[PDB]
Amino acid sequence: LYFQSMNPTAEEVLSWSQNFDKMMKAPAGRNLFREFLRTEYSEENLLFWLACEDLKKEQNKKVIEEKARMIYEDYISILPKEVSLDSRVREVINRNLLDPNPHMYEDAQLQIYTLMHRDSFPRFLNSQIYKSFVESTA
Hints:
By secondary structure, the protein is mainly α. The chain has one domain: Regulator of G-protein Signalling 4, domain 2. The chain has eight helices and no strands. The radius of gyration is 16 Å and the shape is globular. This is Regulator of G-protein signaling 17.
């Protein structure tokens, strides 16, 4: 059911510039922002953020473990593809690593969210990708 999110209304699009959180929650918002991040080679930050969102919704124990593993090897391991996290935040992930839960990565997710909001988002709002997008929906 991204089908219903596919082509966003003007009223949906209107709420995004004043609300990064609203945009980050809309599939079409994230997809637009993800194009812009690709041009700055920082896409992985959003992909990590998305994977942490996907892990939170999961409920079956086995798939939580599989997903937590996948996030670690893709975004947190040194061996890639890695996102920049503080040591404080890395050591909390490591302690949560032997007994995984849906909310293991939340401090790391919040750190990368705050970076995107601070550094990436305001350059997104002045990008051609964005301004061209709002121009089309209007």
